[PDB]
Ligand binder design. Sequence first.
Ligand SMILES: *[C@@H]1O[C@H](CO)[C@@H](O)[C@H](O)[C@H]1NC(C)=O
Ligand SMILES: *[C@@H]1O[C@H](CO)[C@@H](O)[C@H](O)[C@H]1NC(C)=O
Ligand SMILES: [Cu+]
Length: 481
Amino acid sequence: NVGKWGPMVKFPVVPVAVALVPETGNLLVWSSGWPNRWTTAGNGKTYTSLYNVNTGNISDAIVQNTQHDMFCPGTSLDADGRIIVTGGSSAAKTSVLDFKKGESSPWTPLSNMQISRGYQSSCTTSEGKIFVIGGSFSGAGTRNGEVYDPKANTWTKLAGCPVKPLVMQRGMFPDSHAWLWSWKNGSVLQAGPSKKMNWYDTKGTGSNTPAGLRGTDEDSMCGVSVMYDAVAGKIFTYGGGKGYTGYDSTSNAHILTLGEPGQAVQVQKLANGKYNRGFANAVVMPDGKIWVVGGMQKMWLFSDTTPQLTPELFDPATGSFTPTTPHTVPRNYHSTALLMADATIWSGGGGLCGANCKENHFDGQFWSPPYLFEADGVTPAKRPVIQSLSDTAVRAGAPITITMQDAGAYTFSMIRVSATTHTVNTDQRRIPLDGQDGGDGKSFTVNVPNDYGVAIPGYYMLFAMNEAGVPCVAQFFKVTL
Ligand SMILES: *[C@@H]1O[C@H](CO)[C@@H](O)[C@H](O)[C@H]1NC(C)=O
Ligand SMILES: *[C@@H]1O[C@H](CO)[C@@H](O)[C@H](O)[C@H]1NC(C)=O
Ligand SMILES: [Cu+]
């Protein structure tokens, strides 16, 4: 039992960026101002397409954003499940999609950023603000840190949050794709890709302080990281290279353990993965395993060379990797992967290099992990069902009563609804939840962690896993301020 690939789909745009839409769980994908190519200046618009998980069908490409070419942006989901995309080819702009108004309805404008930028990272802070830093694909000026207040609809520079301490030594865009992880009291850990990690404080006029080196790791551009147990403060990191392009990626794997902001982050070095990867994606699953898919060995853009076609499942409880079933198409630069509400995992994309470019990959597939199958690894297991939640918009600390269709012993986790492009996914985090049996083996009460630095505001998927480890299809709910 190594899981199983689902059937292949082929979008009418190259799915370079993708987002899970709250409530439905549909998968929204976008490229740029063209379906199949990009430019630095962009086309003043974006093509998007949407996979519907209720029907299994894909809709044809539309120009859904008519003011902003959202190639190479920052992405974050805010406290209400709005997808906020910054910069990129239209390097000054902020756009927003509110799913409630229609998954295919026009993206609408928000305030321009103070500093124009592209290939920055964006994250939603414990206050529900949006912090960006870096990003020199486009724009101008030192790409210092700024913060978006979505109540005020303003962007403010944070003099105390310079980019300098995160910049790597070599290669293109050394200030870009920071591994940003929101934490307690408005803090953000930049965990990489520079071997030097740094705390940022997004309150006030800003502050920053070293968080320590990432053990013995080297600079790791377009390595991956994921916060697989926010309650324990754990982040898994893998791979990357000394520069954006030009060098061999690594199979280095670490676990970071966060304590208090401004303190030193603990780093443990694991056994290496079997495959070295740059431009991979990492996805945390409801059981706390991490799936690492794609990437290449010697890093170049728009290239299918030295592809790693065999993904790996990492289990933090064993500190070990296991290979899963190979795919046939490379998933290198501009590839994406994302957890779906049915606990399968999207993988696809790659390329975006013009008409008749053989490195364009419009396609992808959904990977069903081992937990969806019986011990023979081929028969689909029966799945539990959440009938209801007591509440769907709860505060930090607040209880939620979860009513299962069938009586039994269940475990729970909530995974933050997320989006990804260019290896960057700041939105994804897992919180394991202790469930209190309510008497009947059917109603269970959990509490949201009491800290908004752990339970970052916004939408989550609540999964219940039965005694076999088989997860249900998630319910959505939000954590409010
Ligand atoms: C897609 O749409 C068709 C009708 O065009 C519908 O019959 C079908 O059930 C939907 N899903 C799949 C997976 O074909
Ligand atoms: C939050 O951070 C600020 C620094 O901006 C600090 O003044 C305060 O001590 C922190 N609050 C808590 C509850 O730790
Ligand atoms: Cu790119």
